């Protein structure tokens, strides 16, 4: 049905935008951005540690 | 959810640390007192060797199975694509 | 024995009060957003430096790896016509 | 990528069907002609047992590789929770003994504030 | 039923022999590779020490929605991990405020004992 | 009875953009393969 109609199901376009002084809803959305940004910055650390060695091996 | 001596639902699942097989505390204890051995493998085993009682501690009693489900449906996707390509 | 149980019971009561003060929250919301703006700043600046440092080294290796992938797509397409 | 017998990059790789390992044909052939065996496990193997379809593949890159990635994410984050569950059980245990020593001591502060003032109330009157 | 590391139902559980605790094979291995120890008892344990020891499949219900479920569940776990860590920092923080008062109080008792000692001398005279 | 894939530098996207593309690419290929 997805291929026939030529329409992909929409994903969560939420984390990217958000807004300060929101409510209890944006309090969650804010706290989401922190944990994923810390996971992000940890996910970039173990890549850079090896760096280009892991890439050129593949 | 079954003992490996009688076949009952174990209310205190203890296991021997020589052959991995979950028994019930009553039956395994009676087997050890009969002769100091593991009932399945006939290896050396004692009462202190057994790990008794449930394990939940610093754990808390979803998510992981969703990924498992995502794998299971993909497994079909690959199987279908093969038979479609053969023909 | 009695002193040990009275401390374990009180510790469970304070633990329930700590889980209750956390469940109600999820003034205070402005501080968390600013804490993120520090993170967003600090982290994304690090990310952009880690990215651009990687990109400089790895966009070259991407092209190397990605132009090699295109060779499989032609090495395969010829393979079938020859088998056929 | 390597041959397990020599350690070179094999120019004609043939995989055995008893100890699963990629050997160089020219090397393994001589090993079989010496004695009918697989070099690693020492199980029987002949030359016909050694082996050099239509679905096209693409290289292993960042669906299955994406699913195994999300296991690494969650399995690592699950250990992150232990670091805070275990450390919480030390802090709360030190807090319990700390608040008990506070509750056991403040009864003695209340009595000394009574006794030192009572000694001042007693002595000054005399 | 539960592995005492993550909280999952283990699909290849393994038990440690230094401390009676059924862990999951993946998680216990990572810990041993970090430091050769048991996570609960901190006893010297290795990978060869482990002895490899219910499966009921989840039938969600009657696919585009399942995409958004997995999104929400990761979105929830991210906050359920976050909330549990700020609570750890503030329970340690409030614990540190108690330690200052504990040691500050036992200095205030020393002056109060002096006032009692001074009083006992005057009463005798 | 090892392979290495270098996880991209911009590796949110794994949940949203990457996973979306994977089930697009699976969907529109098999449909086109059924057409073939």
Q: Is B4 helix (H, G, I), strand (E, B) or coil?
A: coil
Distances (CA, A) of D103 to D71, D96, D115: 47, 10, 19
Burial (CB count within 10 angstroms: exposed 0-12, middle 13-18, buried 19+), residue D33: exposed
Instruction: Dig out the tokens for E11 from the structure.
Output: 């699909």
From A2, A44, A54, residue closest to F4, measured CB to CB: A54
Record: contact B84-F26, CB cut-off 8 A: no
Largest Cα–Cα separation, chain C: 87
Q: Where are chain D's structural domains?
A: 1-126
Q: Is C10 left (phi over 0), alpha (psi -120 to 50) or beta?
A: alpha
Residues in A closer than 8 angstroms to E79, CB to CB, are 28, 31-32, 35
Record: contact C3-D96, CB cut-off 8 A: no
Q: Chains C vs B: touching, with 3+ CB pairs under 8 Å?
A: no
Minimum CA–CA partner of F10 in chain C: C51
Minimum CA–CA partner of A32 in chain F: F12
Q: Is C49 left (phi over 0), alpha (psi -120 to 50) or beta?
A: alpha
**How many whole angstroms separate alpha carbon A29 and alpha carbon A19?**
9
**How many whole angstroms separate alpha carbon F33 and alpha carbon D106?**
81
Q: Is the separation of the CB atoms in A8 and F20 below 8 Å?
A: yes
Phi, psi of E49 (to 5 degrees): -65, -30
**How many whole angstroms separate alpha carbon E30 and alpha carbon E47?**
10
Instruction: Dig out the tokens for B14 from the structure.
Output: 């203890």
From A24, A30, A38, residue closest to C33, measured CB to CB: A30
**How many whole angstroms separate alpha carbon D71 and alpha carbon B70?**
12
Q: Is B62 helix (H, G, I), strand (E, B) or coil?
A: coil
**CA of A10 vs chain E CAs: smallest distance (Å):** 8
**To one decimal place, what's the resolution in Å?**
4.0
Q: Chains E vs A: touching, with 3+ CB pairs under 8 Å?
A: yes
Phi, psi of D2 (to 5 degrees): -115, 160
Distances (CA, A) of E50 to B21, B48, B77: 14, 17, 36
Residue B69 CB contacts under 8 Å (≥ 6 apart), including other chains: E58, E60, E66
Number of other CB atoms surrounding residue D95 within 10 Å: 22
Domain E1-56 has CATH 3.30.40.10: yes
CA geometry: angle E8, E11, E17, nearest 5 deg: 85
């Amino acid at each position: 049905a997805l291929y026939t109609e030529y329409l992909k199901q929409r994903n969560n376009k939420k984390r990217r935008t958000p807004d300060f002084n929101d409510d209890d809803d944006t309090l969650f959305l804010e706290e989401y951005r922190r944990k994923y940004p810390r996971i992000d910055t940890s996910r970039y650390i173990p890549n850079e540690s090896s760096e280009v060695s892991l890439l050129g091996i593949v | 959810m079954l003992c490996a001596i009688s076949g009952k639902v174990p209310r205190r699942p203890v296991l021997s640390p020589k052959s991995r097989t979950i028994f019930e505390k009553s039956l395994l204890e009676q087997y050890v007192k009969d002769t100091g051995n593991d009932p399945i493998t006939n290896e050396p085993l004692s009462i202190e060797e057994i790990v008794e009682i449930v394990p939940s501690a610093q754990q808390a009693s979803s998510i992981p199975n969703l990924l498992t489900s995502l794998q299971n449906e993909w497994d079909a996707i690959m199987l279908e694509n093969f038979k479609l390509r053969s023909t | 024995x009695x002193x040990x149980x009275x401390x374990x019971x009180x510790x469970x009561x304070x633990x329930x009060x700590x889980x209750x003060x956390x469940x109600x929250x999820x003034e205070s919301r402005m501080q968390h957003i600013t804490q993120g703006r520090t993170s967003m700043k600090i982290q994304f600046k690090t990310a952009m430096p880690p990215t651009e440092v990687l990109l400089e080294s790895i966009q070259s290796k991407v092209e190397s790896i990605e132009q090699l992938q295109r060779k499989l797509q032609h090495v395969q397409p010829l393979e079938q016509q020859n088998n056929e | 990528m390597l041959c397990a017998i020599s350690g070179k990059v094999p120019r004609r790789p043939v995989l055995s069907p008893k100890s699963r390992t990629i050997f160089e044909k020219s090397l393994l052939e001589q090993y079989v002609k010496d004695t009918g065996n697989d070099p690693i496990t020492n199980e029987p193997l002949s030359i016909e047992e050694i082996v050099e379809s239509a679905q096209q593949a693409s290289l292993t890159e960042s669906i299955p590789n994406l699913l195994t990635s999300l296991q690494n994410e969650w399995d690592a984050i699950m250990l992150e929770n232990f670091k805070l569950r275990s450390t919480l059980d030390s802090l709360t245990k030190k807090l319990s003994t700390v608040m008990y020593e506070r509750d056991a001591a403040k009864l003695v502060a209340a009595q000394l504030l009574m006794e030192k003032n009572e000694d001042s109330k007693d002595l000054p009157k005399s």
